[PDB]
């Protein structure tokens, strides 16, 4: 009875998707002016990570970025002058995520030690010290995103997105619904919703206030490794192991467009939009990133300058440059 | 004012002094990943290393090893195993006694061997609880060919060095399981990565030397491949 009722509920959901699929984004946007061949050159290369860079996060000022490497270092770089503002020795060498607070006062990181450690940069003492440890997750911390100086949203490998109160260090809200390791987040501009791709080819739109899954999107054929909202916050794009990126629209609730190429048989590690959202920047496992025209699904260009797998990708909040970490321990900035 | 520029430059000189100081320590220390199961006996081998994740230190001949056992995670390991692609070697520990679970360890070995990211890492494969394997063969109740029909057409390899007072039946069994692992190792592993099979029990006072010894062969061959020798 349960199996039949659940399956028959999916029928009208699929029917309403086909009903509202009046046309295709390709058909509507087939007459727009193409973005044309885009050539971004490496502007600065940041050196001094010993091991592979796994994560990276820009600051809100578009100047400082924080990078994590698999050797217990959280180096905060100055992208203008290429200087190490701070180097934080992490307790566990294995760190899979890092976030820089919107205020820039604190910096977070976590990995296979199951703890989203918060480090206080504004300590009056010589160097930085660990602010608080966030225990309560039972799986590798895939991603950690700040909401404000006291609220942090985390993801783990135990199908658990959690929202924490860093003052008390207690998991206030837990988000449950994923059937797979949750690999990434993306907060909406207003920080009221956040999407979350997991290892079950299903991105779920969560509600921060309620803790309930507002919507669930499928269309991918493998683990989703990256996800990012469109800068307005009414859509998002995802990157999976099936060597394609799919753009989903919250209000329409279908797969608007897919970014796949015949010669590409490598998964996507990271995606990110430009400030205008016209370019999608997907970081492939074939050691370079490709710049997809988000409205035409055309390869505008390629950022080929990494020796190893591209692990992370960021665009500054003013959009003036694109950082790109990789497993070759080198953090390059593009423009 | 130019004062802030010099202080920013001054910190970078002090920061990059610390990174160089800790770079020597990081490169001089070998990282290992320990893998197995509930009944494998990873817990017993880490006890022999007396010289959410579990960090084991042992010093052999003034060389530091970090042995990383991962405890916290779920049974799905296809995304956190990508962290350990830069390790020296994967210490894969197998329970050779339980033949029911022994096919699952072969599939786990195959996924590691053929992994797009682990395809350049050597595996120091340990076949633990060989004492419990011997008493299983001698009893005769548990039959290998029930699980592995190919064992009916197997003979002890010519490269066999049985221990004194070892029954022929044990050596025929204990080498069929080893040889079964090496079918996957020799199918696709071509100089990129190497398997180092071994036979350990719970009462051995070694497996730290063997890791030290097998790591030295891994590092020796790594150097020789750069010189286009191997």
């Amino acid at each position, epitope marked *: 009875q349960l199996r039949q009722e659940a399956e028959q509920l999916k029928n009208q959901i699929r029917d309403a998707r086909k009903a509202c699929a009046d046309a295709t984004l390709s058909q509507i946007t087939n007459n727009i002016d193409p973005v044309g061949r885009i050539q971004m050159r490496t502007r600065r290369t940041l050196r001094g990570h010993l091991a592979k860079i796994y994560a990276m996060h820009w600051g809100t000022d578009s100047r400082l970025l924080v990078s994590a490497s698999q050797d217990g270092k959280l180096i905060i770089w100055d992208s203008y002058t290429t200087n190490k503002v701070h180097a934080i020795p992490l307790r566990s060498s294995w760190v899979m995520t890092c976030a820089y607070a919107p205020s820039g006062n604190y910096v977070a990181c976590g990995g296979l030690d199951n703890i989203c450690s918060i480090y206080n940069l504004k300590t009056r003492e010589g160097n930085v010290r660990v602010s608080r440890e966030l225990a309560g997750h039972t799986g590798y911390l895939s991603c950690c995103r700040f909401l404000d100086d006291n609220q942090i949203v985390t993801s783990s490998g135990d*199908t658990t997105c959690a929202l924490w109160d860093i003052e008390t260090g207690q998991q206030t809200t837990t988000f449950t619904g994923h059937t797979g390791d949750v690999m990434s987040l993306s907060l909406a501009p207003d920080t009221r919703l956040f999407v979350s791709g997991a290892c079950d080819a299903s991105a779920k739109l969560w509600d921060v206030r309620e803790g309930m899954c507002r919507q669930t999107f499928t269309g991918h*054929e*493998s*683990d989703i490794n990256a996800i990012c909202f469109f800068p307005n916050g009414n859509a998002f794009a995802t990157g999976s*192991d099936d060597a394609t990126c799919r753009l989903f629209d919250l209000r329409a609730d279908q797969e608007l467009m897919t970014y796949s190429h015949d010669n590409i048989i490598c998964g996507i590690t990271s995606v990110s939009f430009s400030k205008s959202g016209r370019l999608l920047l997907a970081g492939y496992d074939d050691f370079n990133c490709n710049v997809w025209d988000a409205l035409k699904a055309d390869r505008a260009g390629v950022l080929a300058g990494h020796d190893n797998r591209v692990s992370c990708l960021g665009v500054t909040d003013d959009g003036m440059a694109v950082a790109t970490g990789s497993w070759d321990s080198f953090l390059k900035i593009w423009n | 004012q130019r004062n802030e520029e010099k202080a920013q430059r001054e910190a970078n000189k002090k920061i990059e002094k610390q990174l160089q100081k800790d770079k020597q320590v990081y490169r001089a220390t070998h990282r290992l990943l320990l893998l197995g199961a509930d009944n494998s006996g990873k817990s017993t081998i880490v006890k022999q290393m007396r010289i959410g994740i579990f960090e084991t230190k042992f010093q052999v001949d003034k060389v530091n090893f970090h042995m990383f056992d991962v405890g916290g995670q779920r049974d799905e390991r296809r995304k956190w195993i990508q962290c350990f692609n830069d390790v020296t070697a994967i210490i894969f520990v197998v329970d050779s006694s339980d033949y029911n679970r022994l096919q699952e360890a072969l599939n786990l070995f195959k996924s590691i061997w053929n992994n*797009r990211w682990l395809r350049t890492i050597s595996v120091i494969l340990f076949l633990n609880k060989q004492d419990l394997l011997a008493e299983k063969v001698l009893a005769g109740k548990s039959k290998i060919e029930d*699980y592995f029909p190919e064992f009916a057409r197997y003979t002890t390899p010519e490269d066999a060095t049985p221990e004194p007072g070892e029954d022929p039946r044990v050596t025929r069994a204990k080498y069929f399981i080893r040889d079964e692992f090496l079918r996957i190792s020799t199918a696709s592993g071509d100089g990129r990565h190497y398997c180092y099979p071994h036979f350990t029990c719970a009462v051995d006072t070694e497996n730290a030397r063997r890791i030290f010894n097998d790591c030295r062969d891994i590092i020796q061959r790594m150097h020789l491949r750069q010189y286009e020798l191997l």
Partner: nanobody
Amino acid sequence: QVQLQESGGGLVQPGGSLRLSCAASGFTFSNYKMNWVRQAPGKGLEWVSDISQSGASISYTGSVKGRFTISRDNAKNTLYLQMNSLKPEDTAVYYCARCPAPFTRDCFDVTSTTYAYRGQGTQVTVSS
């Protein structure tokens, strides 16, 4: 959506023949190394057999080697497990498990407790 709906299964006397069919949907069938896994009553998941992308390389658990035949039909996007001889040991639920990544010979996590790309499963029980 990725969907795997197995068919076949039921009571067959020992020595019987049974044809399990796995109709894949919502992905390119031709890429993934399809597997077969089964769960004995009061027992953990175990792997039965697999098949490569084009059907080249085929392996079996050994407990069913020579008794079970596996083939994939890329025309209709279907997987098969032709059973020849059944033992009372074979009583289990067969799940049609798919390989996570599309173009790789490795297959991590197919026998996992909560794997995503596995089918619902069909009870295959043997008795007279």
